[PDB]
Design a protein around this ligand. Structure first.
Ligand code: Y6Y
Ligand code: Y6Y
Ligand code: ADP
Lengths: 576, 251, 125
């Protein structure tokens, strides 16, 4: 049957559910001699196709509890006045086979009322379901798990104490989980040796477990269409050996990925960033300060408690564009192995234009659920720029979105895990309230990368590309007196583009030469340009440009010295 | 727009064009969710070239010299940026943007991951002008007597639209002359019924030199040299520095 | 090349050691004007002069205490501008001309350009 092996994604909420349900189910007799209330209901919510029903079935099988599935529309499709009988009989039958697990798939259909509550019979169904759910006499060990797309879609009374008192957001699987899902979905098709499922997994961003299964099936169907159809040898049952002779090639998977259309790309991603400190070449003072502020409270919470100091839970990065603030935030999140949530400027601008700031509440709740997390508000000054910056609106710096963010931060800190990081290229226009204590008070300045930092940035950008050892990278980094990280990335991309164009043009001509003059003996000399050379980099650097002018760096230096530690205490000595 | 259509045709990929009126309608109506629908449609029809023609229309509508009190950000452009940021997953949709006022375009549009590759389309050259005239006059019957290279060279700075207007005016003059002439000739047969019917065919069967001369008499340069100067400024406002032109590796 | 020539011309009078690679200094100065290069050279000369005056003086001050005490050796503590003086000078290197006003100069040069479209002009054959 289905078990933990079938449950893919390694998303680490299956472990939480296990810890939740073993003792109530794995050790049911224990609770008989101990006075404790187990989890009467667990609300699994997330994007559709994430395997919530699969997870519930696997838990039921691995714990031995009698699994009962109450399909939402199955009862809803039944005639009014007798569907209530179906729900009551389902609970009674689950009660009989104690311990039992009752799974309500698509719970947002039985009790969708969000206090709007249209209709008459559906109100009866929701109220009777409430009576049954609250009617659990704590006898036996029936655990009621329900599936819902979002927590707010179901009736709020279902979310109350004793009905569904604890919720788990399965969420979209990540690259590691996408790879494991691909492995589980590719185990009987005799996958080819060339295909590794790693490149596909990385390119598979935005898919869900159902999406991964559909992509694998589409690749298999492409393989079946490409071969074994030309022969057209078919019978009632295709020969096992004949079908096994085919191997799903990388090309088939690539085409399937091109024909994927993932079912929820837009959904926000809660993922441990893969970026590491290696990608950023320097910022040692900044790196150490970030390590302090974030890592120290958790690695050594006892020492923070000993001195009675509450660590700051907000940091605001300020600096010129393209210097690596987003990368620095990702790296700091990676070092602590905490989930990273990034709120770019377009999202804030959308909330501001639409006059919908309640999304800030939802974003903060999501960050709270995925703890430990690093809630990063990238380019937080976007709203101020949108309203102006030199003259702007007649009013002050306060705006709806920033006010909601401040309210959530003030109401935050309770969680002890969410850490707010803010990045802004225009510190002058940022609202001052953002910098007050209890908010993003720790201001960190990210300067233009140094020569060593520039070398590291070039190496990180060119790690994947084949770069000839002849081209000296230290010389190029030193040559770039004030290039930003974005400028270095542009130079590397232009060099790669030049190399790609030259290689394409050359092999194309070489193919004409064989077509025009068919050689008697075929002897390919391989690639005329196998790796990026000095001339490519020289031509690319010919177009190198400094995006960040020295005047805006001067303004940042002004603000930095606008956070000046006075000029009279530098020699402070105690009287002794 | 023609260049975008040609590039789409060469790749044999579907072409979707979002003209300025559509963007202005979405902006006035405060309905930017249509951008989501447009991007989804472009995604479904892959390979496609999603072209946002005259993308600067909203900025012009809000001003351009003084404009609104706020910055360049607007609802429609913000939604387009959000869709583009959430795009690239499809690997097939390609966004092409055309703007006659690059100065007022939102800078966020040009950031990496967005329409960063800026391409400048200059006024057609003499050879380009000849090709444009030939394309405009391919359908119309043009007499071999009228030299097209001379006309293209004569037009020192005419835009493609100006050349199209000249060709259309020449065709209009030819059509009017043909209509008037055959109408008179019909009077001539009604007023004085000829004993033997012998139609001499069309008095003007194809466009002649005189038609083109009269049309060129009204030729005009729509694009002034000052706006070309502003475009040249922006072009050199994307200047590749002035100190690396001689960059050599140490060897 | 112009920067190298300017540096050589400024330092012709001053005694500069052959070990200092002036071409490297010229190439490292990305967009320094002639005034900036002259300022760097003057600062290097000033640093050399200050070091020579302080070292010769402090040596004489110690030596004068004992009459005829140390040998009569005629030492020159700094007889030429050294490399360290050039690093000392470059620490204070400054870019006088901002890229924005260079932008303005190139703008005026473009406005003065001979319009466009007459490059291909050719008399009829
Ligand atoms: C002991 C303590 C721990 C704490 O929390 C620690 C923590 N855990 N997970 C996280 S989050 C995760 C880590 C990486 C990404 C985010 N954190 C945390 C807390 C603050 C800042 N960054 C992280 C708070 C406050 C206290 C205390 C201090 C003084 C006193 S008294 C009365 O003066 O003696 C009483 C209580
Ligand atoms: C190989 C690849 C193809 C691609 O896509 C190609 C593509 N197909 N249809 C289209 S669309 C259609 C064509 C005409 C109209 C539009 N495209 C496409 C892509 C980009 C721009 N224009 C077209 C993306 C990205 C990659 C890659 C590059 C580096 C690495 S690594 C880890 O550094 O080794 C991994 C993956
Ligand atoms: N991590 C996974 N491992 C194996 N199958 C998965 C996984 N995630 C999703 N699936 C697929 O999703 C299909 C249906 O999705 P489901 O489990 O019912 O979730 P939901 O009810 O939210 O749509 C299942 O048949 C299963 O094959």
């Amino acid at each position: 049957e289905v078990g933990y092996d079938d449950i893919g994604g390694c998303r680490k909420q299956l472990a939480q559910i296990k810890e939740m349900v073993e003792l109530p189910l794995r050790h049911p007799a224990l609770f008989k001699a101990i006075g404790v209330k187990p989890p009467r209901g667990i609300l699994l919510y997330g994007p559709p196709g994430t395997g919530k029903t699969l997870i519930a079935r696997a838990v039921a099988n691995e714990t031995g509890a009698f699994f009962f599935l109450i399909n939402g529309p199955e009862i809803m499709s039944k005639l009014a006045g007798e569907s209530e009988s179906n729900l009551r009989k389902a609970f009674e039958e689950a009660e009989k086979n104690a311990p039992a697990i009752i799974f309500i798939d698509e719970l947002d259909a039985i009790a969708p009322k969000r206090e709007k509550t249209h209709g008459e019979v559906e109100r009866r169904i929701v109220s009777q379901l409430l009576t049954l759910m609250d009617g659990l006499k704590q006898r036996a060990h029936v655990i009621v798990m329900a599936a819902t797309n979002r927590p707010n879609s179901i009736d709020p009374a279902l979310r109350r104490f004793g009905r569904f008192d604890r919720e788990v957001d399965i969420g979209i699987p990540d690259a590691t989980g996408r790879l494991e899902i691909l492995q589980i979905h590719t185990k009987n098709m005799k996958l080819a040796d060339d295909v590794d499922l790693e490149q596909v997994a990385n390119e598979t961003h935005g898919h869900v477990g159902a999406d991964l299964a559909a992509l694998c099936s589409e690749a298999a169907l492409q393989a079946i269409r490409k071969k074994m159809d030309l022969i057209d040898l078919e019978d009632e049952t295709i020969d096992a050996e004949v079908m096994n002779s085919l191997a799903v090639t990388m090309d088939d998977f690539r085409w399937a990925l091109s024909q994927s259309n993932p079912s929820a790309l837009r959904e926000t991603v809660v993922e441990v960033p893969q970026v590491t400190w290696e990608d950023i070449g320097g910022l040692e003072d900044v790196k150490r300060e970030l390590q302090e502020l974030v890592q120290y409270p958790v690695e050594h919470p006892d020492k923070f408690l000993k001195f009675g100091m509450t660590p700051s839970k907000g940091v605001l990065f300020y600096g010129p564009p393209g210097c690596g603030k987003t990368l620095l935030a990702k790296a700091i999140a990676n070092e602590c192995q905490a989930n990273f949530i990034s709120i770019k400027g377009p999202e804030l601008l959308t909330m501001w234009f639409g006059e919908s700031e309640a999304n800030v509440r939802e974003i903060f709740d999501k960050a709270r659920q995925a703890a430990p997390c690093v809630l990063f508000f990238d380019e937080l000054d976007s709203i101020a720029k949108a309203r102006g910056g030199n003259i702007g609106d007649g009013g002050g710096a306060a705006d709806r979105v920033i006010n909601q963010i401040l309210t959530e931060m003030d109401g935050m800190s309770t969680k002890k895990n969410v850490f707010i990081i803010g990045a802004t290229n225009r510190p002058d226009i940022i609202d001052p309230a953002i910098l007050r204590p209890g908010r993003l008070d720790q201001l960190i300045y990210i300067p233009l990368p140094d020569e060593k930092s520039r070398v590291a940035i070039l190496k990180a950008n060119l790690r994947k590309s084949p770069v000839a050892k002849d081209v000296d990278l230290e010389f190029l980094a030193k040559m770039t007196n004030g290039f930003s990280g974005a400028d270095l990335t542009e130079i590397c991309q232009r060099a790669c583009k030049l190399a790609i164009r030259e290689s394409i043009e050359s092999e194309i001509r070489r193919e004409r030469q064989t077509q025009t003059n068919p050689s008697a003996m075929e002897v390919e000399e391989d690639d005329p340009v196998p790796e990026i050379r000095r001339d490519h980099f020289e031509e690319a650097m010919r177009f190198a440009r400094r995006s960040v002018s020295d005047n805006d760096i001067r303004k940042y230096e002004m603000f930095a010295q606008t956070l000046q530690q006075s000029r009279g205490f530098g020699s402070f000595r105690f009287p002794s | 727009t023609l260049l975008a259509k040609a590039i789409a045709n060469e790749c044999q990929a579907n072409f979707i064009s979002i003209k300025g009126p559509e963007l202005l309608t979405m902006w006035f109506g405060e309905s930017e969710a249509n951008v989501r629908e447009i991007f989804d449609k472009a995604r479904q029809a892959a390979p496609c070239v999603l072209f946002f023609d005259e993308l600067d229309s909203i900025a012009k509508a809000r001003g351009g010299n003084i404009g609104d009190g706020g910055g360049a950000a607007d609802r429609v452009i913000n939604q387009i940026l959000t869709e583009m940021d959430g795009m690239s997953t499809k690997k097939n949709v390609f966004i092409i943007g055309a703007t006659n006022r690059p100065d007022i375009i939102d800078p966020a549009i040009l950031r990496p991951g967005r329409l960063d590759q800026l391409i400048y389309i200059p006024l057609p050259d003499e050879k380009s002008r000849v090709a444009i005239l030939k394309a405009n006059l391919r359908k119309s019957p043009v007499a071999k007597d009228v030299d097209l290279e001379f006309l293209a060279k004569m037009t020192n700075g005419f835009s493609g639209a100006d050349l199209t207007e000249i060709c259309q005016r020449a065709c209009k003059l030819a059509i009017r002359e043909s209509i008037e002439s055959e109408i008179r000739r019909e009077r001539e047969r009604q007023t004085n019924p000829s004993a033997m019917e012998v139609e001499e065919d069309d008095p003007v069967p194809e466009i002649r030199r005189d038609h083109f001369e009269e049309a060129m008499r009204f030729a005009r340069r729509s694009v002034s040299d000052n706006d070309i100067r502003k475009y040249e400024m922006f072009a050199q406002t994307l200047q590749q520095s002035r100190g690396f032109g001689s960059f050599r590796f140490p060897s």
